[PDB]
């Protein structure tokens with residue numbers, strides 16, 4: 102059964118409630134993380150919690166708990182689930198923005214759900230992305246604002262002025278002439294899956310260019326994939342009307358996915 | 371009474387008691403639209419236009435309305451009757467717990483906040499306010515969504531602007547909660563609603579300008595045009611017309627609220643009953 106830790110207690114997820122005075126509800130003031138488990142251990146726990154604090158600070162939210170307290174809650178919750186878990190800690194604005202231009206009455210809660218990996222067919226066939234001419238403002242912040250992600254495709258792709266940055270919940274990688282191309286962290290969220298893939302490429306002597314791949318480059322691309330802690334590496338075979346390479350998951354993508362899964366122990370906490 | 375209220379789950383609650391499930395995608399993913407409705411003489415201003423805009427925002431966001439507009443109107447009127455004072459009414463439509471395989475939010479929730487109105491301080495109308503320009507735009511600009519994060523983090527840097535101003539590539543569109551008007555040579559300039567939210571205060575001001583034979587240009591005023599401007603103001607149902615005397619480091623005219631701004635504000639308040647429901 103899904104859980105939510107809020108106000109010092111593990112509740113059944115469906116019973117957990119937040120006051121409508123919270124500025125996460127009224128004004129979208131909130132940041133969060135997605136943490137997933139392998140062998141019931143949290144992957145990149147410390148990197149995720151550091152990113153949460155970074156998101157809060159960038160958003161003028163004063164952390165309502167220490168990272169040590171959040172880590173303790175997360176571990177106890179995963180133990181309570183007794184299955185592979187997706188953990189979603191949320192930091193809210195709370196009820197007011199002070200004259201100091203900070204949110205000082207922040208609330209927090211942590212959702213625990215049974216993990217939902219994409220269907221194995223999506224790894225076999227790969228997925229389609231829908232490009233939009235828009236960017237994430239405050240792109241280093243993992244904020245709760247996903248409206249543009251909803252309003253064919255597995256996921257939207259932020260392509261401001263035809264420069265591919267990233268998906269709504271995913272890092273984007275292009276494969277062109279055996280090179281990895283991915284947006285630099287001046288433009289894209291500092292993905293934990295992204296970090297691991299860059300480390301694996303360095304180990305594989307695979308050249309990485311940290312630049313925004315262009316929509317105009319997609320016809321000369323052999324492969325593409327998106328990354329995130331739940332989806333791992335998910336092949337991308339179509340972006341808008343453009344097929345990627347010959348429309349099936351590519352050799353370098355499947356190799357990096359295999360290496361990812363074989364190596365992931367090193368980053369489990 | 372005068373205590374703040376929230377209508378949720380068929381009941382008027384004290385505002386402090388109202389809670390929403392954390393499963394709601396308004397909390398998890400920012401999936402929410404809302405309106406700000408205010409009263410004059412305890413009557414809702416532009417109620418029908420606001421409720422039509424709410425349904426427009428919901429529909430544009432793939433949210434299935436969880437109540438009819440007739441039912442939202444009933445709730446809003448009953449709540450204003452309970453406050454028995456000048457009220458700010460905030461109806462919220464939430465995404466609810468799931469985004470279906472039909473790419474709709476079909477289990478939307480709703481609630482309506484009723485608060486004693488808080489008009490800007492009379493000094494802000496006397497002195498006017500400053501705005502902070504950013505090189506960013508509202509996507510889905512016809513939708514009144516709950517996403518205001520940029521409005522707050524954009525006071526992290528900024529020394530004391532009342533509001534951010536979306537000026538993508540130097541083209542002024544609007545504020546985070548306000549329509550923006552420039553006055554140049556006795557004529558009104560304001561972004562077209564292809565780019566800016568269709569403000570209800572904006573609509574009334576254009577109606578007043580049409581009555582006053584005041585020329586309106588529906589184009590984005592440019593940051594580069596501000597040195598040749600006489601006046602500026604921002605509009606919103608609570609703030610009415612609020613003079614703008616500074617945008618970033620640029621003073622507007624001689625830094626005091628202008629003649630045409632005060633005249634339109636006066637005509638607005640003299641005429642307001644026409645738009646009450």
Ligand SMILES: *Cc1c(COP(=O)(O)O)cnc(C)c1O
Pocket residue numbers: 135243267268269270271272290291292293294295328329330331
């Ligand atoms: C969450 C997120 C990702 C993925 O980050 P991981 O740490 O790999 O799970 C990528 N991009 C965006 C915009 C995100 O919000």
Ligand SMILES: *Cc1c(COP(=O)(O)O)cnc(C)c1O
Pocket residue numbers: 406514544545546547548549567568569570571572605606607608
């Ligand atoms: C709500 C809002 C306004 C003001 O609308 P009114 O109907 O005049 O109250 C203006 N611009 C934006 C972006 C808004 O969200």
